Design an enzyme around this catalytic site. Structure first.
Site, short mmCIF file in Angstrom:
data_model
loop_
_atom_site.label_atom_id
_atom_site.label_comp_id
_atom_site.label_asym_id
_atom_site.label_seq_id
_atom_site.Cartn_x
_atom_site.Cartn_y
_atom_site.Cartn_z
N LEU A 168 0.81 -1.21 0.00
CA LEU A 168 0.00 0.00 0.00
C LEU A 168 0.85 1.27 0.00
CD1 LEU A 168 0.81 -0.58 2.83
CD2 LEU A 168 -0.12 1.74 2.77
N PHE B 283 -2.20 6.33 3.93
CA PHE B 283 -0.92 5.64 4.10
C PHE B 283 -0.98 4.64 5.26
CE2 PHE B 283 3.39 5.80 6.18
CZ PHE B 283 3.97 4.89 5.32
N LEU C 7 -0.70 -9.86 6.38
CA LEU C 7 0.61 -9.26 6.14
C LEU C 7 0.58 -8.25 4.99
CD1 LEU C 7 3.63 -9.27 6.90
CD2 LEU C 7 3.95 -10.99 5.11
N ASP D 98 -3.45 12.61 2.68
CA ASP D 98 -2.57 11.60 2.10
C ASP D 98 -1.94 10.72 3.18
OD1 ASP D 98 -3.02 13.22 -0.26
OD2 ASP D 98 -1.20 12.29 -1.08
N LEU D 99 -1.96 11.19 4.42
CA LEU D 99 -1.39 10.43 5.53
C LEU D 99 -2.39 9.42 6.08
CD1 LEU D 99 0.90 10.08 7.73
CD2 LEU D 99 -0.43 11.71 9.08
N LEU E 139 12.63 15.93 5.37
CA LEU E 139 11.79 16.28 6.51
C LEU E 139 11.02 17.57 6.26
CD1 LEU E 139 12.35 14.37 9.19
CD2 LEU E 139 12.50 16.63 10.26
N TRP F 72 7.31 18.00 5.28
CA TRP F 72 6.03 17.93 5.96
C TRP F 72 5.15 16.85 5.34
CZ3 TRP F 72 5.06 17.92 10.39
CH2 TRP F 72 5.02 19.01 11.28
N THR G 248 -2.43 4.53 -5.14
CA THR G 248 -3.34 5.66 -5.25
C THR G 248 -2.77 6.71 -6.19
OG1 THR G 248 -2.77 5.69 -2.89
CG2 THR G 248 -5.03 6.10 -3.43
N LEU H 79 2.97 1.41 16.84
CA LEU H 79 1.76 2.15 16.47
C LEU H 79 0.57 1.67 17.30
CD1 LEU H 79 2.00 2.48 12.59
CD2 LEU H 79 2.51 4.17 14.37
#
Length: 162
Positions: A4, A30, A94, A26-27, A19, A21, A116, A54
């Site tokens: 993905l 993800f 997985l 879109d996050l 780094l 942003w 995407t 997470l």
């Protein structure tokens, strides 16, 4: 195994060491893509990751180190070490998240792909790895034109064939 990630007109993915942003829309995709199960990630990735591990998402760290560890997360070195975990954990699925270095690692094992195609353009110095679209098959593909012309995207679902 699924892959993905999001690609734009040019076909970019992310950065290697800038780094700048991250986008909120879109996050969400993800992560939401494979969250809630055994989601793989590169060592470098697991680090920058909003959190380690997470919340509600089983993460895995891929590195060449034979002693690499992680608090709560799983430590693997290749696509063989990950399949080993998922082998003993047939309950969860997985799905590889990243990064690029990790993408081409399972490209020869991935049984399903998720991309995407965003109408808008995105910055970055890292490009997507060479996928064998000929080896896989498109099971679903539909573009979603949102209010924002650049916030558009197409959900493509591929399934590896024999």
């Amino acid at each position: 195994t699924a892959f993905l990630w999001a690609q734009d007109r040019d076909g970019l993915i992310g950065k290697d060491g800038h780094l700048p942003w991250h986008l909120p829309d879109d996050l969400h995709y993800f992560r939401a893509q494979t969250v809630g199960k055994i989601m793989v990630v590169g060592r470098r990735t697991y680090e920058s990751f909003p959190k380690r591990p997470l919340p509600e998402r089983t993460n895995v760290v891929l590195t060449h180190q034979e002693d690499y560890q992680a608090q709560g997360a799983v430590v693997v070195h290749d696509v063989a070490a990950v399949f080993a975990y998922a082998k003993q954990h047939p309950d969860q699925e997985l799905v590889i998240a990243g990064g690029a270095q990790i993408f081409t690692a399972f490209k020869d094992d991935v049984d399903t792909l998720l991309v995407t195609r965003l109408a808008g353009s995105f910055e970055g110095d890292t490009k997507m790895i060479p996928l064998n679209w000929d080896d896989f098959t498109k099971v679903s593909s539909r573009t979603v034109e949102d209010t924002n012309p650049a916030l558009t995207h197409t959900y493509e679902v591929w399934q590896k064939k024999a």
